[PDB]
Enzyme design. Structure first.
Site, PDB file in Angstrom:
ATOM      1  N   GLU A  95      42.707 -10.790  27.020  1.00 27.81           N
ATOM      2  CA  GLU A  95      44.076 -11.178  26.575  1.00 27.81           C
ATOM      3  C   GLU A  95      44.740 -12.572  27.310  1.00 27.81           C
ATOM      4  O   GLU A  95      45.450 -13.190  26.672  1.00 27.81           O
ATOM      5  CB  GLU A  95      45.081 -10.191  27.094  1.00 27.81           C
ATOM      6  CG  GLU A  95      44.731  -8.730  26.377  1.00 27.81           C
ATOM      7  CD  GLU A  95      45.176  -8.666  24.616  1.00 27.81           C
ATOM      8  OE1 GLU A  95      45.665  -9.967  24.258  1.00 27.81           O
ATOM      9  OE2 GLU A  95      44.742  -7.891  23.951  1.00 27.81           O
ATOM     10  N   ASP A 105      50.355 -14.756  19.142  1.00 22.67           N
ATOM     11  CA  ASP A 105      49.012 -13.895  19.375  1.00 22.67           C
ATOM     12  C   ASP A 105      48.128 -14.192  18.124  1.00 22.67           C
ATOM     13  O   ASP A 105      48.653 -15.116  17.490  1.00 22.67           O
ATOM     14  CB  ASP A 105      49.152 -12.394  19.624  1.00 22.67           C
ATOM     15  CG  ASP A 105      49.453 -11.718  18.299  1.00 22.67           C
ATOM     16  OD1 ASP A 105      49.649 -12.412  17.323  1.00 22.67           O
ATOM     17  OD2 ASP A 105      49.872 -10.407  18.520  1.00 22.67           O
TER      18      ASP A 105
END
EC number: 3.2.1.17
Length: 164
Positions: A11, A20
């Protein structure tokens, strides 16, 4: 390696609001803020999550706190889910991390939909599970990460992460 190190690799860490892989406002270590296109909505969610007016920026400690909460939530989601819990309980520690990783990325309901993969994992048919897992939007949209997670399920080792 542990689940925190694994997800930190997958991440990253960003202290300002970012989008994202799906274009959704996110912050920290993959903490989804909202699926709304509104940056203001995302900033409101951020302030609510942190408990102060952040103006779209947080500290490393704050990011790590959200991350702790999010990993906890993923584990709890697995344990409360009738489809996921038995598979999770059947797995060894390393493969449990792969499961938590998937639930962190796509949510409890999303992973619970992987019916055939879940069965193969429960049956410890690792190569077959790996093949099935790759037949997914997940794999096609985030192939490098999916490949790492799948290798972890296939081998029960950290080989896909160790160098990262």
């Amino acid at each position: 390696m542990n689940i925190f190190e694994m997800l930190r690799i997958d991440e990253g860490l960003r202290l300002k609001i970012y989008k994202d892989t799906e274009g959704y406002y996110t912050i920290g270590i993959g903490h989804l803020l909202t699926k709304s296109p509104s940056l203001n909505a995302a900033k409101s969610e951020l302030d609510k999550a942190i408990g102060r007016n952040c103006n779209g920026v947080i500290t490393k400690d704050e990011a790590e706190k959200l991350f702790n909460q999010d990993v906890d939530a993923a584990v709890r989601g697995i344990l409360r889910n009738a489809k996921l819990k038995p598979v999770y309980d059947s797995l060894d520690a390393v493969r449990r991390c792969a499961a938590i990783n998937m639930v962190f990325q796509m949510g409890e309901t999303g992973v619970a939909g992987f019916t055939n993969s879940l069965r193969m994992l429960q049956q410890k048919r690792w190569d077959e599970a790996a093949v099935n897992l790759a037949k997914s939007r997940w794999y096609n949209q985030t192939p490098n990460r999916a490949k790492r997670v799948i290798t972890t399920f296939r081998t029960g080792t950290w080989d896909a992460y160790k160098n990262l």
